[PDB]
Amino acid sequence: KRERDSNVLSVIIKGDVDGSVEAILNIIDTYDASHECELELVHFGVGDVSANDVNLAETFDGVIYGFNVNAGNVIQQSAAKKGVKIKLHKIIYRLVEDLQEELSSRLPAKTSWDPG
Amino acid sequence: KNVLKIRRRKMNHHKYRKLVKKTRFLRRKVQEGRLRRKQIKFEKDLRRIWLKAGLKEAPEGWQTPKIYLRG
Amino acid sequence: ATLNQMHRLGPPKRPPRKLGPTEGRPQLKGVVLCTFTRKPKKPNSANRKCCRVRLSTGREAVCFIPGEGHTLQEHQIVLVEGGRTQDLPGVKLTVVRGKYDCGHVQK
Amino acid sequence: PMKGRFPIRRTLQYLSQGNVVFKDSVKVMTVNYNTHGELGEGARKFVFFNIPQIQYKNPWVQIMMFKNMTPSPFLRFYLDSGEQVLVDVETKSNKEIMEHIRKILGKNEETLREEEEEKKQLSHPANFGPRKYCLRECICEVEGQVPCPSLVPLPKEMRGKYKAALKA
């Protein structure tokens, strides 16, 4: 095992439909600021943020981004205990603004990658 | 017979004595803390006894002796 | 031991079976955290392929990767069976080939 | 080899050889005997050998023992009616003591056979059920009757899957 660098944002993606999941994944794949901060896609799926998503986020010190999905109270409690951050969103550009915010936060400033 | 097992036990015992000598202070502090917590636990046990038995307070003129303290 | 002693002790209080690496389950699901190699104990010499997985039970363990060559990268899901790798100390889980993200060996 | 002198005493085959089954009135049996004395040898060997058999055949009778309490050995049976039967056993061999207790308080072979007849009344051959209680699980086992489908497939005529097609 090796300790992960600070400039590596691990993200779980959860969508209401496969179309939304694919759209978010395309946005992520457009990423080009690899040098300043890597954007790893630990796992993606369709449905409400689940215990397995929280477990992946805990295992990889990642952040779960939910697109028009729900985070039950039990899941919220477990994520709070395990130190994961679940960020639900209902607008694609709001989610993208949040994602760029996290990338800038991980940076050593504002990120240089742009979605369009 | 040979004394290989006795030699193994000898090395174990010598290393244990050396470790105790090397870490006596920490062991003393931990043991004192353990004794204090043991006394508190025993007092809690007696308190449970009488409170469940239905006494508002420890019996008349009763004070729990500190049985786990040297003094 | 006299008959009285046998009666007093009762039947032999056999030790309970102790769970192995897989918590006594045929397979577990893991997420490959890292991939690396390990030198086997003497006299064997090799760089055996291994990975670190967060098993579904919450424990992290080193799983051996059988077969000539593989592709397991980080973040990938694998199934892991028991059975110790004889020449690796402390490694007691084999990644099952042909399941989830670990494809069969290529001819 | 089994521990102890005369390990045969610790075999179900031996404990089933006991021929003494007490009447329902017998409830307690106290055996006073002496650990020494050539006259108490019969009682000593009776306690050593036959007491296991008596207790095995009579699991509800309280059998108690008493060493060197009185000058002579003796049995004493306390019955359900309050009666107490004292049986002197000095100078009698263990076989003689067993025969005497069988005569005075044991159940006769005819009564034992009557109980066995009552028992065998239960297992009616014609009943069908699990092998634990019945000789046959189903009528299929009886030859001539339509066999179990699991072994011999039924005709499409009888099978309900095709009776449905005929219904259609």
Added chain:
RNA sequence: AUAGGUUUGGUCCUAGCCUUUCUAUUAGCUCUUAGUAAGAUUACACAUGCAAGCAUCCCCGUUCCAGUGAGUUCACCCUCUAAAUCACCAGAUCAAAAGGGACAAGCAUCAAGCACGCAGCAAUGCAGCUCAAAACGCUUAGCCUAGCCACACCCCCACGGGAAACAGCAGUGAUUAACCUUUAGCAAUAAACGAAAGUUUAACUAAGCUAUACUAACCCAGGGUUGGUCAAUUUCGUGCCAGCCACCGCGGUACACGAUUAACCCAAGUCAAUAGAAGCCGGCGUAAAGAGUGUUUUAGAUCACCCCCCAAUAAAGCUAAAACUCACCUGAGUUGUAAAAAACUCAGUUGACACAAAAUAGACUACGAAAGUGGCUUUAACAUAUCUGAACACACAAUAGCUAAGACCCAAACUGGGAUUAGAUACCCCACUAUGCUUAGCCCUAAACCUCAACAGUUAAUCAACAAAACUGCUCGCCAGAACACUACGAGCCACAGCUUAAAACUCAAAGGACCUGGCGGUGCUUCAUAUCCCUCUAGAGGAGCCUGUUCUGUAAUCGAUAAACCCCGAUCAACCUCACCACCUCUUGCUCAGCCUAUAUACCGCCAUCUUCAGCAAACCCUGAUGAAGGCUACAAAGUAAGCGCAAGUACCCACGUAAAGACGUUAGGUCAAGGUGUAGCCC
């Protein structure tokens, strides 16, 4: 178990692990058909549909059936007696509540629970009840399967609250390795209702899906394995790498890896992972195990009827030898040892002189439970029985150690100095302290070992090995692979760096006990070395120059030998050649039915070094060891006989002497691929 593999250089024993067998789940690869059986991983959350009506209104039912296993000794027998059926009744059947008894697994590092009983009409009085034969407690589990117990979303309950409930059928999200249809019918049986024809029923019946299983079949067969256990591999590729293994193990130029062929086993399956079925009458001197010692109750056993003294212990007193100290005389050295140094000026004779220790006896073998006890006297005193029995208590327990107060001749950790050494925090020398002694308390440990429990009994037909011959009966204590571990945590203790009790995780296939053979021993005794180990004798080398070999340097410039057993060695021989080396140049079927002095002496032949300046090696037999590895010797002989080889003998030289020659089997994978040949691998303009 009908067993098998695995500890070692080898054998025997003990022991763990694993293999072979049979199920079930999951996974991988693969799959044709028909009948039948069985089917979420989860007491987590649920969209949707359905699942309880009947009937002249009242009643009855919706408490059943069906479901799950969260919880868990409400399940079984007896007593008593509710509810229900027998058209009203009858007691019969069935069966609640209540009472009595029985009723799972693990942990005692859960040993105390804390009112857990009784008497009396009551008043109230007694102070008791459970528990090492496991109470109280923690963890785990549905069970004893014609089926039974428990739960019904949680708060045990369910007035109430949390909240809006599939653990009814089908189905779904989540979760797990685990994953069936959102079918039809009341045609049959069962239930509910009705007086009844009848009606309702996701109970059930008949269907749907699924190699999970069984049966049957097809003129369309895969899976696994092929080093041993264990059935069965050809050729390639790789070369301690890639990789394989249930265990032992394989791979450094492969019957074990990957491919390929073939074969072997099972076969619509195969077999990778997991789980279960296989688990106490065996042992304790050395393998783990007789707990440091003794004594109870409750109990168990039949071994109960049969039948002189020596050194125990405590107290008191005493002292012979020798020290120390102090006194006279003498002397200048004394101690120290492998040799010295440091150290004291003190040393010798004689006399006085202990609170320390207790020659000879003792070649005795006694006393005590054990630890222990061996100067003398006295006092007190050495339990009981014609059994065993304590972390379950009481009393002891060497030496060391702690607290306090005394003693202190001598010894003596520590400390200092001297010496030694590469260093010497030691071994050797000197001084001295705690301490060793007394008193009074603690501490409670020993290789506390005679590593062999107590009592009773036998020597009869033996006994893995060694040890101190082998056992029988009985009882208690203890042990179940190694290490973790005289450890961690808990508990108790006048203990505070402690003692007793004492685990688990991770790891391994071993660990271990006893022997055999050999090597080794700064190993013992004895006898030797005849140019040999020391001394002894002669002549040399080591100091000088030169010649020559080797190493190191240098160069474009060999190679090999290189401790004895290399170094004027391959060479009884290099200016060219020899020459295999280097630089430049030239040729390609080439002197060769090519060639290579290219690697491999760790594939070899061939010829040799070496102990060997040895006398042993020995096939084939026989015997001993319980028929184990192994061993085989006694001459006033006791299991050895041995062909053959070697030695020897014989031979050359000058004897019959001596020198040659010879010198077996083996060791150093000793040397030589560069005498030559040859296997393998390699270059072929």
Added chain:
RNA sequence: AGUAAACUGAGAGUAGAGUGCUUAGUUGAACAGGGCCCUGAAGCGCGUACACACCGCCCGUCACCCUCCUCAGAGGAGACAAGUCGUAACAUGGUAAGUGUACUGGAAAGUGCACUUGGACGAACC
């Protein structure tokens, strides 16, 4: 012992080439006795944790990667693995070994007091 020492030839091999090798011959000595404190040999023994057989085996510290446990971070254990300092044990292991206990020390360990043989004292007198 015609040995050492000294001296003089011949030969092999070369076209030539050695202070080298093989060989012939002459003069021609001294000690030869004590031993086993030193090295090896033999015989009988003893010990052995070695068996690639002491150039063996192997202990502990100091540093290095893993796995598990206890712990407010740190320690312990085991494993892998090489170095490091020593040589503590295995032979009388070079100070016999070990148990308990105490002091001391880079580290195996040293010593003190008692105890065990799981060492020997060679086994008539000598």
